[PDB]
Amino acid sequence: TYAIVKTGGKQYKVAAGDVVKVEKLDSEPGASVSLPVALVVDGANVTSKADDLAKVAVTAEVLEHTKGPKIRIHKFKNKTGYHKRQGHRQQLTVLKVTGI
Amino acid sequence: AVPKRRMSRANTRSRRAQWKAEAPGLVTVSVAGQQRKVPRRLLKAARLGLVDLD
Amino acid sequence: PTYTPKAGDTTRSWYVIDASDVVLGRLASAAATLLRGKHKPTFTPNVDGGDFVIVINADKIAVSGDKLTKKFAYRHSGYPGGLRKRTIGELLEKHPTRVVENAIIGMLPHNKLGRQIQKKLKVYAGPDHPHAAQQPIPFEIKQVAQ
Amino acid sequence: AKRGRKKRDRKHSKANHGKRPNA
Amino acid sequence: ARVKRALNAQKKRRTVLKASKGYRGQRSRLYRKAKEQQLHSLTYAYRDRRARKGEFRKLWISRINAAARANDITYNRLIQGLKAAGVEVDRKNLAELAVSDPAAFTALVDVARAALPEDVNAPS
RNA sequence: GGAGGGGAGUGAAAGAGUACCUGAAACCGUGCGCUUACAAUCCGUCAGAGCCCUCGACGUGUCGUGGGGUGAUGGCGUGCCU
RNA sequence: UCAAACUCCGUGAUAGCUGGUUCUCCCCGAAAUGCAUUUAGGUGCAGCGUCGCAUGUUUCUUGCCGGAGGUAGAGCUACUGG
RNA sequence: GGGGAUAAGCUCCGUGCGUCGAGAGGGAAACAGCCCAGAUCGCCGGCUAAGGCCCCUAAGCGUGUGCUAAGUGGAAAAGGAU
RNA sequence: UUGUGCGCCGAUAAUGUAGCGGGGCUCAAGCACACCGCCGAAGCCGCGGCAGCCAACGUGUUGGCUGGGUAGGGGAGCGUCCUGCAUCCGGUGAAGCCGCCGAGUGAUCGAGUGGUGGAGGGUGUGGGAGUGAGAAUGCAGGCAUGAGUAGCGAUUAGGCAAGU
């Protein structure tokens, strides 16, 4: 009994109790959010029509706001003398899916 | 002619370890009542005292 | 995270393909698909999961056109002027399993894994095979219609 | 001679659209 | 005001050398040769991060097409059906359904078959 | 035999012993963990099985918004400066 | 060491010549053309870059309107020739 | 367009022609100058361009009507040929 | 006989097939015309982070366009040393060196902490620089690869017993 959730432009397969890392949302930690659904499987049956999916939404709570792994970028091209250094850390929000 | 490149670490040690020694095979002989180990080549002499045992 | 096969997740089964009157190119591509485990949905490029493929009746296999006499199978011993060739017709008479093997061997990846896949292909000239204890599942070459 | 004609020929490929550097 | 360049220069030598640990041969001991690797190492990564997205999308297609042909439907038709049927599951989860729980995938295939046209070669 | 060293002492310290403050890097060993004798490798990078160590929660070992070390195998990949 | 020895000094000789010039990011971003040159692998001015000030679409694209050519083509009892 | 032998990956010109120079990514097996397209960073989301969809290799041993017997496809001339 | 679509011969080099990338294909996986999908990049879209130019209003947020780049022009910064002034740490252990755990868009940071150490350091705001090297067949010191390799310097020649 799981569902595929659209958030941040990406679809994650979640169920009750799973913990996911999605793009940053405007919700303080401890708050609850609701997310649309791309598909729901309940036992053997499958809900795939756009109409019934719009009726159901996945509720989840925001655990905390974290940062991703550090990305170090050193662009370079030989015989020229072109170095460019720049880091990056993506801001991530981790949710705990409570119920569907 | 001369070596063109600096031989790497893996290639140096691979050939170097072939430069080793083989320990002699020692047998036990009894001289004057004490047991000392001499190579089997020198077995006969050590019984006649021709071999000095420190 | 996408699912990746663990230690004991892989499984094998035995397929026997009757090579009689099948086109060499068509039979080989079918076998090369099986051996790489392309049919399973658990496919992973760096882990082999192909199913042992037995090819029987390997000497009756049909080659179209004039390729029975005008297609050569070359080989070089490394010595100067050491290039010796055998037309397919001759190669079928001496040892027939070679024609099927090579045409499959050149269909698989050429890396170290493709060398491991080859261990799972047994091909016999006669209509009988010794692997009856493994219960090969007879396999046939169809094409899914679209 | 063999090398020269082959290079000018492989300009006719579908993905080159009939032109190639150094002819 | 003579300045000895030991403190200011040793700083960048530690960064590269510590970050180049695990390399084979000289590329793990000497700052000059390690820096030559860090130029390549961080160029390979930035190229492989972009290529990883295309690579992983690919692996999923291979798993989809393998399971789609097990249900007797080619992949290109299966996608044409799903787009027409209004199912918008991406390839990552479609490959996930195909491997883990095959029962749902058969349900999805049957949806794709229904929404396909009667004669797919029609000039419609 | 000496050189040198081990006890015992001086010393706050002998990781201050007249080769002596602090004691880096190249270079040279020793011990331990992983890996390697069918294999074409600008020596990395992205996936990644297995083994070993660690931090938590739950029993005998089994997962996790985990961390480390090795990396079998696949994909990509033509040194730096002038 | 000899088609004009060695050492010091002028002296840090001078080279339209070869080499070298060390930390980071942000924005913009060319030329290999013209004229002249004891000149052609140099340089000066112009052309193309950037920064500041001034002027504001004057730049550019499309439609329409007014222009002058002498190429492509064609023609030869229309000229000069064949 | 000139020079050349209407040869050169030749040489000298014109072009609000392109690209490389000073440019990554996809295609052409590899292959600065050809074709698609100008990289602010991250994503294990989606649609396409050139090019492809039997296996290597991603997606069609796709559907309809024909043609080829030469592996033509997967190099070439005057000319020969029921 | 005429015009056409595909073909045949002409055909022909020197390491090894070698004028499809390979296997293979005429049971086209070849050619021509129509039709149907799909794969495909750092292109376009989705979600998030940053910066430049401009505008809207505001006592710095929002929005819109833009962000490949060598020679080169402009702006802003990290690190090191010496000093004015003001402050704080240090034999209850500074600097330096080796680690662990982390941090920043970059040079880099750690008044976060372990080990070695034994006497000076940090910060704010100004002043001044012998202030940043990977390369000049660059200079000095230490140490590698070749390598336990070549050699051990004539044309005479050494041997045995005993001793220390």
Swiss-Prot record, chain A:
Q: Name one GO cellular component term.
A: ribosome
Keywords associated with the record: Ribonucleoprotein, Ribosomal protein, RNA-binding, rRNA-binding
Say which domain of life the source belongs to: Bacteria
State which residue ranges cross the membrane.
none
List the Pfam families hit by this protein, alphabetically: Ribosomal_L21p
**MF annotations from Gene Ontology:** rRNA binding; structural constituent of ribosome
Q: Name one GO biological process term.
A: translation
What family does the Swiss-Prot or TrEMBL record give for this protein? Belongs to the bacterial ribosomal protein bL21 family.
The cross-references to PANTHER family, in alphabetical order and at most eight, read: 50S RIBOSOMAL PROTEIN L21, LARGE RIBOSOMAL SUBUNIT PROTEIN BL21M
- Subunit structure, interactors included: Part of the 50S ribosomal subunit. Contacts protein L20.
> What function is annotated for this protein?
This protein binds to 23S rRNA in the presence of protein L20.
Please give the name of this protein.
Large ribosomal subunit protein bL21
Q: Which organism is it from?
A: Mycolicibacterium smegmatis (strain ATCC 700084 / mc(2)155) (Mycobacterium smegmatis)
UniProtKB/Swiss-Prot annotation, chain B:
- Domain of life, per UniProt, equals Bacteria
An annotated Gene Ontology molecular function: structural constituent of ribosome
Q: Which residues form a coiled coil?
A: none
GO annotation terms (biological process): translation
Asked if the record carries the keyword Ribonucleoprotein, the reply is yes
User: What InterPro entries has UniProt attached to this entry?
Assistant: Ribosomal_bL32, Ribosomal_zn-bd
Record's keyword terms, sorted? Ribonucleoprotein, Ribosomal protein
> Compositionally biased, Basic residues: which spans?
1-18
State any GO CC term.
large ribosomal subunit
* Disulfide-bonded cysteines: none
Query: Which stretches of sequence are listed as region Disordered?
Result: 1-19
Q: What family is it from?
A: Belongs to the bacterial ribosomal protein bL32 family.
List, alphabetically, the NCBIfam families matched.
rpmF_bact (TIGR01031)
Q: What is this protein called?
A: Large ribosomal subunit protein bL32
According to its UniProt entry, this protein's organism is Mycolicibacterium smegmatis (strain ATCC 700084 / mc(2)155)
UniProtKB/Swiss-Prot annotation, chain C:
The record's CDD domains line, in alphabetical order, gives: Ribosomal_L13
Please provide one cellular component term from the Gene Ontology annotations of this protein: cytosolic large ribosomal subunit
* Any GO BP: negative regulation of translation
Q: Does the keyword Ribosomal protein apply?
A: yes
Q: What is an example of a GO molecular function annotated in this UniProt entry?
A: mRNA binding
> What does the organism's lineage look like at the top?
Bacteria, Bacillati, Actinomycetota, Actinomycetes, Mycobacteriales
Q: Which gene encodes it?
A: rplM
What role is this protein assigned? This protein is one of the early assembly proteins of the 50S ribosomal subunit, although it is not seen to bind rRNA by itself. It is important during the early stages of 50S assembly.
The answer on whether this UniProt entry bears the keyword Ribonucleoprotein reads: yes
**Keyword annotations for this protein?**
Ribonucleoprotein, Ribosomal protein
The domain of life for this entry's organism is: Bacteria
Record-given protein name: Large ribosomal subunit protein uL13
The record's family statement is: Belongs to the universal ribosomal protein uL13 family.
Q: Give the multimer and partner information.
A: Part of the 50S ribosomal subunit.
Q: Which Pfam families match?
A: Ribosomal_L13
Curated annotation (Swiss-Prot), chain E:
Q: Which HAMAP family match?
A: Ribosomal_bL20
* GO CC, one annotated term: ribosome
Its protein name is Large ribosomal subunit protein bL20
**Phylogenetic placement of the source organism:** Bacteria, Bacillati, Actinomycetota, Actinomycetes, Mycobacteriales
Tell me one GO molecular function of this protein: structural constituent of ribosome
Q: Which Pfam families match?
A: Ribosomal_L20
Q: Which domain of life is it from?
A: Bacteria
Naturally occurring in which organism (per UniProt): Mycolicibacterium smegmatis (strain ATCC 700084 / mc(2)155) (Mycobacterium smegmatis)
Q: Does the keyword Metal-binding apply?
A: no
SUPFAM superfamilies (alphabetical): Ribosomal protein L20 (SSF74731)
CDD domains per UniProt: Ribosomal_L20
Instruction: Describe its function.
Output: Binds directly to 23S ribosomal RNA and is necessary for the in vitro assembly process of the 50S ribosomal subunit. It is not involved in the protein synthesizing functions of that subunit.
GO BP field: ribosomal large subunit assembly; translation
Q: Which UniProt keywords apply?
A: Ribonucleoprotein, Ribosomal protein, RNA-binding, rRNA-binding
State the family it belongs to.
Belongs to the bacterial ribosomal protein bL20 family.
Asked whether the UniProt record includes Ribonucleoprotein among its keywords, one would answer: yes
